[PDB]
Amino acid sequence: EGVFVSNGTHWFVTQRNFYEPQIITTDNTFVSGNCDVVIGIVNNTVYDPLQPELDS
Amino acid sequence: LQIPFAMQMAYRFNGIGVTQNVLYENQKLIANQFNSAIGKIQDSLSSTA
Numbered sequence A: 001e002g003v004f005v006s007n008g009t010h011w012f013v014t015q016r017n018f019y020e021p022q023i024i025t026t027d028n029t030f031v032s033g034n035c036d037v038v039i040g041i042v043n044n045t046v047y048d049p050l051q052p053e054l055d056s
Numbered sequence B: 001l002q003i004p005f006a007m008q009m010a011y012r013f014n015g016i017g018v019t020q021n022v023l024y025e026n027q028k029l030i031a032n033q034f035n036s037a038i039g040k041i042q043d044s045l046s047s048t049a
């Protein structure tokens, strides 16, 4: 429900009409297919909130 | 407010209830169909009053 944005060093997702940066996560995003098709795709971490929970 | 044209078209796909990856995964097909359809306007307006 947002747009991916960078401040020059870090990547965030925001709502479109008001700047409010959030960490990119598996809850903020959806997957479709692999890296090869999309024109202008960028490499970044996507955080998964379950993985530190499994680390408990 | 500037936005890249393909990202503006992904917002417009969301507005008709089609998911954004349907644009980015088909972007050349969508751009070719637009460029082709504008050529039909050009020819139709040149062809008949």
Ligand SMILES: *[C@@H]1O[C@H](CO)[C@@H](O[C@@H]2O[C@H](CO)[C@@H](O)[C@H](O)[C@H]2NC(C)=O)[C@H](O)[C@H]1NC(C)=O
Residues within 6 Å of the ligand: A007, A008, A009, A010
């Ligand atoms: C982009 O945003 C990040 C995260 O807010 C900024 O990183 C922080 O910057 C301050 C000042 O250098 C540090 O004290 C923090 O430790 C940094 N946090 C992290 C997680 O790296 C970053 O400075 C911003 N970049 C620009 C160019 O403004």
Ligand SMILES: *[C@@H]1O[C@H](CO)[C@@H](O)[C@H](O)[C@H]1NC(C)=O
Residues within 6 Å of the ligand: A039, A040
């Ligand atoms: C973006 O535009 C610049 C300037 O024309 C070009 O160098 C770059 O390759 C383009 N990248 C994409 C993903 O379109």
Ligand SMILES: *[C@@H]1O[C@H](CO)[C@@H](O)[C@H](O)[C@H]1NC(C)=O
Residues within 6 Å of the ligand: A043
């Ligand atoms: C993105 O990451 C992959 C795998 O690490 C790498 O092959 C590719 O060259 C990277 N692309 C860019 C634009 O850096």
